[PDB]
Write a protein that binds this ligand. Structure first.
Ligand SMILES: OC[C@H]1O[C@H](O[C@H]2[C@H](O)[C@@H](O)[C@@H](O[C@H]3[C@H](O)[C@@H](O)[C@@H](O[C@H]4[C@H](O)[C@@H](O)[C@@H](O)O[C@@H]4CO)O[C@@H]3CO)O[C@@H]2CO)[C@H](O)[C@@H](O)[C@@H]1O
Ligand SMILES: *O[C@H]1[C@H](O)[C@@H](O)[C@@H](O)O[C@@H]1CO
Ligand SMILES: [Cl-]
Ligand SMILES: [Cl-]
Ligand SMILES: [Cl-]
Length: 373
């Protein structure tokens, strides 16, 4: 019998439907007491929410796949059992398994596939307009944030550089300190004078007011944006961009959203936590998340269901997940330093705080900073 008491951390607006999922869980596991709350700072900050005091953190918590290597090496999460590993591998798409695997072992329970797309108001821009960055921004305003490296670091990947090597597993493998990296820096800088590019900390509000015709965003906002745009809703994969005078696809990161089990839980509570993590990432639960938020399941069967298959956001995400259109986020322990250092690199190029005469130096220093043992 599974019994115990578990705390579950989810992101703010997810609480209502995780309570529904937990009610489903409790039909099968009536002797597990679950408390569902928001986390202190959300799934994009699980590393530091848990690391501040692992023994006081939730037993099961939402976390993006890039954070897993750091958390595994710190001992905050343990490997999944053989049976749990088999279920993850068999039920979900291959990239979901890759996303949670570190040194040959799975460390979390994947549930959603995340790639950003263009969301746009089709009364302001056409499907043809959004195929290229320069064409889109010549015709309407794209609102975005150059201080968030999750948005723009993948331009370096479009430029032909590697992040932690060919596999994302090589500490010294980032090669952005190159002429190709400089092409990306120049692209950022070009956007400052692009009248169709608006820097904002809240792109969603600009879409809502009609001051932006398009934004780059992820599927955690799919249902939100469908509500904002109504009959004018449209979505597309990322456009091409011009780097060194050549059109190339602009990449996004591919992320896998997961739940992980805190290694501090023990005894019955540990078993209950693992059971909960497995249940809330099962097919039925993934489809409940989809119904409420529009996030894209990783379950193989759920992706093929008619509601998911007919959703234009799902189609655009599965295009973005193809080779060449995105790169799976690495999960190296160095990733937290990478994110911290990448944002000023990119934003400095955009604002001109880093002039072109400094691109090579700044890229060299960046690679040194993010490549330490
Ligand atoms: O140094 C800057 C920050 O670096 C680190 O943040 C990283 C994360 O570790 C990455 O996972 C990623 O974050 C993505 C995230 O993967 C993605 O899911 C999405 O997050 C949504 C979330 O799904 C949704 O439920 C709700 O919470 O809104 C979120 C968006 O606001 O988008 C994230 C990016 O915006 O990239 C960031 C870097 O931006 C580190 O964790 C931080 O502590 C640090 O500040
Ligand atoms: O996904 C975001 C939510 O929108 C915030 O409310 C909070 O939960 O942080 C996460 C990201 O970590
Ligand atoms: Cl697959
Ligand atoms: Cl361009
Ligand atoms: Cl415990």
């Amino acid at each position: 019998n599974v019994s115990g008491s578990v705390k579950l951390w989810v992101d703010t607006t997810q609480v209502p439907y995780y309570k529904k999922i937990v009610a489903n869980f409790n039909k099968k596991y009536p002797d597990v007491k679950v408390k569902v709350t928001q986390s202190p700072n959300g799934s994009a900050n699980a590393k530091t929410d848990v690391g501040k005091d692992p023994a006081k953190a939730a037993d099961v918590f939402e976390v993006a796949n890039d954070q897993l290597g750091s958390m595994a090496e710190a001992g905050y999460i343990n490997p999944l059992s053989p049976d749990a590993t088999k279920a993850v591998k068999n039920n979900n798409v291959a990239v979901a398994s890759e996303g949670v695997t570190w040194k040959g072992k799975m460390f979390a329970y994947p549930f959603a596939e995340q790639a950003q797309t263009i969301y746009y108001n089709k009364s302001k821009l056409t499907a043809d307009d959004v195929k290229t960055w320069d064409g889109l921004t010549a015709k309407g305003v794209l609102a975005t944030d150059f201080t968030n490296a999750y948005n723009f670091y993948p331009v370096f990947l479009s430029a032909g550089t590697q992040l932690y090597g060919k596999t994302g597993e090589t500490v010294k493998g980032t090669d952005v300190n190159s002429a190709k990296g400089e092409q990306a820096m120049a692209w950022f800088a070009q956007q400052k004078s692009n009248k169709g590019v608006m820097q904002t900390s809240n792109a969603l509000n600009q879409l809502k007011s009609g001051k932006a015709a398009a934004i780059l965003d992820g599927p955690w906002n799919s249902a939100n944006i469908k509500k904002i745009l109504g009959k004018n809703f449209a979505v597309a994969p990322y456009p091409t961009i011009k780097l060194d005078g050549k059109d190339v696809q602009m990449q996004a990161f591919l992320g896998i959203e997961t739940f992980a089990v805190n290694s501090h839980a023990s005894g019955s509570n540990q078993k209950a936590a693992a059971t909960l993590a497995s249940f809330i990432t099962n097919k039925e639960s993934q489809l409940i998340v989809y119904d409420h938020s529009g996030q894209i399941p990783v379950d193989k069967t759920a992706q093929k269901s008619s509601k998911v298959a007919s959703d234009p956001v799902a189609g655009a995400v599965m295009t973005m997940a193809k080779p060449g259109n995105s790169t799976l986020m690495p999960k190296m322990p160095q990733m937290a330093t990478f994110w911290n250092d990448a944002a000023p690199l990119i934003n400095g190029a955009y604002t001109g705080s880093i002039p072109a005469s400094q691109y090579s130096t700044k890229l060299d220093t960046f690679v040194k900073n993010i490549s330490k043992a």
